[PDB]
Amino acid sequence: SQIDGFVRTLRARPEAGGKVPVFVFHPAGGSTVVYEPLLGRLPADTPMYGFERVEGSIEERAQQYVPKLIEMQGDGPYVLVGWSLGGVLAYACAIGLRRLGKDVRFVGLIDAVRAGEEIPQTKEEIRKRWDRYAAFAEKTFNVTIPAIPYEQLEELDDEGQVRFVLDAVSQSGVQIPAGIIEHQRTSYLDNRAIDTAQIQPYDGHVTLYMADRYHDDAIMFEPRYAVRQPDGGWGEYVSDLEVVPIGGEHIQAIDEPIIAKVGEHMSRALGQIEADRT
């Protein structure tokens, strides 16, 4: 995998012609190398490019990706796919591309499932979330995370909360590798980017590959992900939603054997698109 800006080449397209590329978008706290199992289950010579992390709200991230998508693929067709946060990013790009008159053929959400219940916007919720992260950081890094004063919780947005903790961490003098600090920073913000995403309507085909449940660690961070709606929270927004059950838990959906089901279904979709453009 070669990287150029925020674009990872997972399989380069031929010099000219060839099949429609699959554009995959990174998950919360990971890179697009996670899509290599999927690529192994897609038709031979299917190109694939991964869009890695950029800063901003979902819409601001899409505003950086959509111009690059068009630079690479022009009028279309567009195949946009993502697990975790990448599914929301793929969906946001599909909306932007459609608004610009581009040809989007397939949006693939790999268990990018909304919380079954609205997350309240209270200091109590912010507190519990940061204490759950403090517990995660102890079980994981055996490190003590500082806590934000209760009456300052609603004075800090997500970025500001993370900045507060990172500074107080370095001011506390705990030894944490910077590489872990940066992975933790992006994982926290990207998980919150899923939490706070506002889904816009999309008049187009979307396939939701739906696992059985979020895994325990996800539910420990935010228990409202223990509940799932049958449409994963997407039915009110998508005119043509196809829900493909894949079993397993959210963390397993990206890897074998669960990804074989995703690849088998997506390969048929890709074969139809290739036939349709020929």
Residues of the shown chain interacting with ligand 7IJ in the complex, contacts defined by CB under 6 A: 29, 129, 133, 184, 187-188, 191-192, 194-195, 214, 218, 221-222, 225
Given the complex with ligand 7IJ, which of 183 and 277 has the nearer CB atom?
183
- As measured in angstroms, the least distance from the Cβ of 184 to ligand 7IJ is 5
- As measured in angstroms, the least distance from the Cβ of 5 to ligand 7IJ is 25
Residue ranges of alpha helices (H) inside 74-117 are 85-99
CA-based radius of gyration for the chain: 19
CB-based contact 164:148 (threshold 8 Å): yes
Given the complex with ligand 7IJ, which of 86 and 222 has the nearer CB atom?
222
Given the complex with ligand 7IJ, which of 6 and 136 has the nearer CB atom?
136
| Residue 218 buriedness (CB in 10 A; 0-12 / 13-18 / 19+) | buried
Given the complex with ligand 7IJ, which of 8 and 129 has the nearer CB atom?
129
| Other CB atoms within 10 A of residue 187 CB | 17
- As measured in angstroms, the least distance from the Cβ of 262 to ligand 7IJ is 18
- As measured in angstroms, the least distance from the Cβ of 89 to ligand 7IJ is 13
**Dist. CA 94–CA 10, nearest whole Å:** 21
131, 164, 190 from 183: Cα distances, Å: 19, 16, 10
Given the complex with ligand 7IJ, which of 204 and 248 has the nearer CB atom?
248
- As measured in angstroms, the least distance from the Cβ of 228 to ligand 7IJ is 11
* Kind and range of the H or E run holding 79: strand 78-83
